[PDB]
Amino acid sequence: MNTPKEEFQDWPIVRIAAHLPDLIVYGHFSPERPFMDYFDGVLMFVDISGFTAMTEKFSSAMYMDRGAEQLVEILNYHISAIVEKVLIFGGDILKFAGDALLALWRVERKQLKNIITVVIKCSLEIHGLFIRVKIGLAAGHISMLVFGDETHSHFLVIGQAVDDVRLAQNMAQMNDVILSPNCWQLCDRSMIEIESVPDQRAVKVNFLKPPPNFNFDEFFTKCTTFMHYYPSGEHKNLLRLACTLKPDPELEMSLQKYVMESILKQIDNKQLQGYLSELRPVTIVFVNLMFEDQDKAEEIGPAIQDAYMHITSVLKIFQGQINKVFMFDKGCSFLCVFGFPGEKVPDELTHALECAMDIFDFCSQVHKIQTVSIGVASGIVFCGIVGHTVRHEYTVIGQKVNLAARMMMYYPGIVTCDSVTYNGSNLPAYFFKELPKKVMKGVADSGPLYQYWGRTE
Amino acid sequence: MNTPKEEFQDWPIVRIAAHLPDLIVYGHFSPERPFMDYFDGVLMFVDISGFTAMTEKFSSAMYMDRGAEQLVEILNYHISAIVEKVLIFGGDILKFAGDALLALWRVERKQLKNIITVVIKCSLEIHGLFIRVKIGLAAGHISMLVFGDETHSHFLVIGQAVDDVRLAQNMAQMNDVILSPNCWQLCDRSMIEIESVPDQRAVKVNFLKPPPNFNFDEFFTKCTTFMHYYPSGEHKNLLRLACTLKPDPELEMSLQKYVMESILKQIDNKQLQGYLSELRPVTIVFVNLMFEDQDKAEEIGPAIQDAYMHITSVLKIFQGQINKVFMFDKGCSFLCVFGFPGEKVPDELTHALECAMDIFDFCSQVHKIQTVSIGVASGIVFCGIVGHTVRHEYTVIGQKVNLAARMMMYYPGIVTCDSVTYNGSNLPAYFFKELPKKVMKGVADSGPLYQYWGRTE
Amino acid sequence: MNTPKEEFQDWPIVRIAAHLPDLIVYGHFSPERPFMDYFDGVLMFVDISGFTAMTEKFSSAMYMDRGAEQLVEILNYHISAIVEKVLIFGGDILKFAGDALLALWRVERKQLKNIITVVIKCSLEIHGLFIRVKIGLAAGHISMLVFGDETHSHFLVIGQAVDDVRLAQNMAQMNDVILSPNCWQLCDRSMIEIESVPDQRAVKVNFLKPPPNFNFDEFFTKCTTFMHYYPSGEHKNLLRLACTLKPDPELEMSLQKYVMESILKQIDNKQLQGYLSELRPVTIVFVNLMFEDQDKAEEIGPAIQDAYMHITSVLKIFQGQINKVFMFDKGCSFLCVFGFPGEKVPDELTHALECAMDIFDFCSQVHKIQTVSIGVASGIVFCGIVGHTVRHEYTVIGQKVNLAARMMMYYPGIVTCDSVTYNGSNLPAYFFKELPKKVMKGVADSGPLYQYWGRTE
């Protein structure tokens, strides 16, 4: 009796799970919204610098109209290698945002110290492989928030360790690995050799200096005891346990809610893969919500849900999409896009502005939202699936993405727009106000910037 | 000198052969029609109960418009496992019909007794893996009929063993394996422990009770001597020898005639795979032809060919397709569909009715057809490729499929239709007659049913 | 710590490289045009006879509109096997043209004699596998020319060895391997048993007669010292080193210039694979340029570039494409096609004729072009990707392709067209002249042939 080869089955549930972390795939939590949970872990925020520039260059004539295809190929080639290292070292990639990603090693409190050594080692091997890579690490208490409606779900992580990992990463120079103060306080200092950072309590890693008799492969093995989904045994040749997920319509119904419809179309083999890699003109609407205490999920969770319910209803009407949500700019940011594959309306600019205004007015009166700020910017952006075959997400990359984010941060409390949006919109000039030009971290020169003052006053 | 890896080649001929049994793939018989052949074997009819209900549920809002994709995934996950067991145990899957399949172990007469033990073991391992599975087994003489025209071919098996396997399967309770009386008469009774079945000569299998020294792997090995296409040697890692078929335009011309054009389009990479999995509104026209003696291929073969020639010409004109033909309802049944992927006409209902009438009038005068009965039912049905990668077929599943079949059986000798068809058709009310409602095995409640009386009388 | 399987990555650069030889993939030469380089090697020209006939047969009704799919399948099945043998024996496939291919073993001069024995052995194993295969071999000095503009590149090989391999191949009878005189002069005659060929200095191979103690596997191993890209070590399971190419946007920009846009669309997963295999009506415009000395790249290179610049600009305007360029008919031939996938214009015939005339007038005054001849023929031709997964190219095959080539050769110095083109064009009868019918090698019977005299005279 034969025992024939069983070919890998790439069921749709498995394809869906590539778009999500283990935190969601294996989370099985309640469908109530908001839902919050609490745990401890180590975070790694990894940023490839330079892709934002490459993006502008990939529009030039030398790319012969295959800029999008060439960009995504060279991006994924690099990001794939970073993803593999993260996964092999036992991390869970939570989210990709542009040319950056955030990874989590969730463990019990007693295990943080040892897992920090694992993540440092991982970081040093990533910084090794290689555009510059910058890595921020943090460790401690972490909250998760899941919010949404009956057809869409989103998650975010929240708390001091989350704020820290982003602060740590911004201090990083080309190729630095930076530890948050708490991470440094919790790590095995007898092994980790650091320099201090000026006017900063975070530290920089110089190297690992293991003691005699220390064997990293053995230490790692001990650490895998604490890793719930590390591939092992018959599945030790796989990068993710999620590669083994079997059809389950209840689970798939729950997981699909996190993935955009156009991605589900590709997964379902109802649209060519090539279709979603593009360099296309879009409008970015970047919404920031600030709270009195951005580390307190039980306060901010309801407010985020409330804002989300309104945001999604106005985006439906003005035809936009939420690409990504994350904690950023001392608050919760929604990266919204008008003109994704299949949503290209005319009057996109006008609508992006009226939508931004509606969101601004409504969110300003949600309880516990202290300040709303929205940046609107338009131009050619890269849209596509970024990452590894086994772990990847749809994202946007471009100078207008960064501009919209910087606008919302440097012009808090108002709706701002760039010149392309201003000039191209339908709206009368006196609905706007020309603003003082600010020097903005990561921005060569915006043309003129404007406040969208709106119809009255 | 290198000896590089030879990658599997998925030539179009190999893709075509997934849609057919070995009985056809390796049959090399005459292209004359009808063609009949005669042999002996064991039949296994396997039915997954419950998918017909799942189908209705997969239309609900909770599936978020991915019902078809979710249905086919969970269906194939289960059916795939059953297919693998059948193939590993040396069976040839002849046909899929909805959530059921029919498999054949063709052998010489002297080998039936031993092969029955093999098939029982297979059945018990299938009933093991697991919606309820019901299995009917029969053994004996089998006739094959191939009918068609110069561009299309169809086959069917015929005879007492075929009638038996279907009778045996209908008696099965959830998870029973039932043997036909002849199978029980031919099997190795010293090994097989049964209970009797009330007012029935068929029996139920309780278990295999092998004698001392009996080793199933050795016994199976002996039995493979009689299996012409069991994968072996260098190909013992394959589920089917047909996976090794090499391009041959004469063979491919002959095999393609059994596969619908829209499936050939997908095989040819001229249409996305996703395209053919759908939950779509269709009209089922289920035609039953009864003969004086439904076990006698030399009598019924010509008549079936004759009916087929007419059926296919009227379906071409009213725009329908033959999905499947099989012996059923004490006769030969054609499962015909109006509105498959690419054939969606307006006035589909009217046309389905006029086509049904034309087929009824013509077939009623074909010599040797005793009674024609046709059931017409309309609604949302699942259409898609069901089975394993290496062995799968396009099929339809749904409550309106079952209704059309039950109508043709419980209202013999006339053309009947459901309420959706009646109400939606173009035709005047007096072309119909409202019928007495019958209690119908496998039907909760049809709305009102009608006879299509037609234009005169 | 796991060491998971790394799946093959089929990056777009790797897909592009399937369409090119190692001579270009690993060439890294200047982007200036023309560019010429010089080396030595052995050439193998392999021709499958009979596919041109098969092509006409695959249009008949018996193929049920899947002629194109069936033709390409049976063609690639055979050509694939020849490609594998060439690659395993260390050859570089330079180009496919219809059902023929040209392969190169580039080496230093001292190594020609040994490499000739390798290529003879290869040839004998190819002639073995098997429509008739005919093989011509030549050896000596070879020039390469790369020509083009800022978005398109083409290469060609030139010189006496190139003329020889084509002459040798035309003398071959069914299943002969023929050596050019120089190849025979350079080979290891103590091992190679030949017959002479009448009124010919080329010879035919009867067999390899190795001496005692000669071991082909050891000899081959020694010879691989001289083969720069022979897959070895960790990559010895691959048919081509190019299968390992990694993303590199500079390299990909340079390589894509050789591949047509519609092929890049498929590579980019923006078009279904099936789309480019077709039997479609096209117009072939076959341009031949003769020079005083067709073996002298430094003279003819500039002229070819000059002609190319004009040809490509008129083809853009009359909507045609260069399919292939190669030395042929004592000159440089451009195989141009009107009506490829996506370029089907109305008045295609008229335009093909006016384009042919423009090219004829311009090329006749390029310095160093002695004679221009152009054959125009229209009908159903096979268009598709021919070859092996790892090495394949888009090509055209058909009786009208061969007719256009024979016309340009047998009616030098003028533009000629077939009857389909004449009758179907828009143009007045007196723009043409009906020509004397010539007996043409490889042509059963053209209908009437015409000169396109043009508007004046």
Ligand SMILES: [Cl-]
């Ligand atoms: Cl997050």
Ligand SMILES: [Cl-]
């Ligand atoms: Cl998100």
Ligand SMILES: [Cl-]
């Ligand atoms: Cl059947």
Ligand SMILES: [Cl-]
């Ligand atoms: Cl059938």
Ligand SMILES: [Cl-]
């Ligand atoms: Cl060439």
Ligand SMILES: [Cl-]
């Ligand atoms: Cl070429």
Ligand SMILES: [Mg+2]
């Ligand atoms: Mg970045």
Ligand SMILES: [Mg+2]
């Ligand atoms: Mg059923």
Ligand SMILES: [Mg+2]
């Ligand atoms: Mg040829």
